[PDB]
Design a protein around this ligand. Structure first.
Ligand SMILES: [Zn+2]
Lengths: 193, 94
């Protein structure tokens, strides 16, 4: 936004949240009447509600950066439920699981998740290792590098950023590391911006 | 109640189901076949360290309640179990 009335290059405009307006500090003109509490709005997607009682909790958060655009809902046993239908419907979802070579490469994330928990590594490290891997796995710069060592290299790339200290020898023992190979794969990815 | 759970209860839970076995019996055709095996994973004594914290940088040290409250940490202590992996074999009972 910018004030029509005045218009001096740097627009000195204030958000008077409690009064619910976006105002021009210089002239006094209210530029917007509709204002939302962002923090309280975010609390309808992410909340204390696991029960499903909350009329406020109406949405669900997602990680575009990692999950991409995959919106899905579990078919599960509710209060009244004949197990027959839950099986039938889930059996049906199985036949409809004809996902791509990369929509099946999200199983490489399931590997990193199993490798981080085993390495006693934090959630942020996974979300960094799963990030660096999702960006370098398809790369020509990496080509036919030992696939087992490429994802182990992204675990060190994740650990370096999240300040969680882990030795190359530690990650080397965690999966299986061909020292020269997982040192070369950790450099092509490091070169990949 | 908590003390009873730690000193006793905890061990009996680690011993109820405890042991898990997987048996790989062959097709009994001829070598590489006619080899029946059974592998064991066993749960022994349960050990419980005094409370500790595993910092960002490797270092695991003793965590005191004030520290726990102030750095928003969990006043937890480590659980350790003696696990034994036994292996057995038979041809085409023993
Ligand atoms: Zn103005």
């Amino acid at each position: 936004l910018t004030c029509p009335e005045c218009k001096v290059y740097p627009p000195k405009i204030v958000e008077r949240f409690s009064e619910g307006d976006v105002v021009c500090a210089l002239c006094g003109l209210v530029l917007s009447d509709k204002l939302v509490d962002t923090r309280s709005e975010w609390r309808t997607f992410s909340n204390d509600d696991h029960n499903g009682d909350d009329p406020s909790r109406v949405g669900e958060a997602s990680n575009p950066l990692l999950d991409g655009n995959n919106l899905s809902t579990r078919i599960g046993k509710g209060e009244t439920t004949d197990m027959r239908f839950t099986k039938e419907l889930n059996k049906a979802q199985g036949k409809n699981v004809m996902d791509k070579k990369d929509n099946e490469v999200q199983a490489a994330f399931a590997k990193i998740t199993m490798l981080c928990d085993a390495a006693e590594l934090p959630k942020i490290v996974k979300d960094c290792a799963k990030e660096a891997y999702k960006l370098c796995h398809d790369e020509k710069t990496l080509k036919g590098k030992s696939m087992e060592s490429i994802m182990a290299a992204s675990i060190l790339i994740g650990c370096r950023r999240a300040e969680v200290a882990r030795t190359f020898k530690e990650i080397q023992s965690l999966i299986h590391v061909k020292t020269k190979e997982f040192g070369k794969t950790l450099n092509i990815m490091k070169n990949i911006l | 109640s908590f003390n009873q759970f730690v000193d006793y209860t905890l061990q009996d839970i680690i011993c109820e189901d405890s042991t898990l076995i997987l048996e790989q019996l062959a097709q009994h055709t001829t070598e590489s076949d006619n080899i029946s095996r059974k592998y064991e994973i066993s749960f022994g004594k349960i050990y419980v360290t005094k409370p500790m914290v595993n910092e960002s940088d490797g270092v695991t040290h003793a965590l005191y309640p004030q520290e726990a409250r102030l750095r928003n940490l969990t006043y937890s202590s480590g659980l350790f179990v003696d696990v034994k992996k036994r292996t057995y074999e038979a041809i085409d009972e023993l």
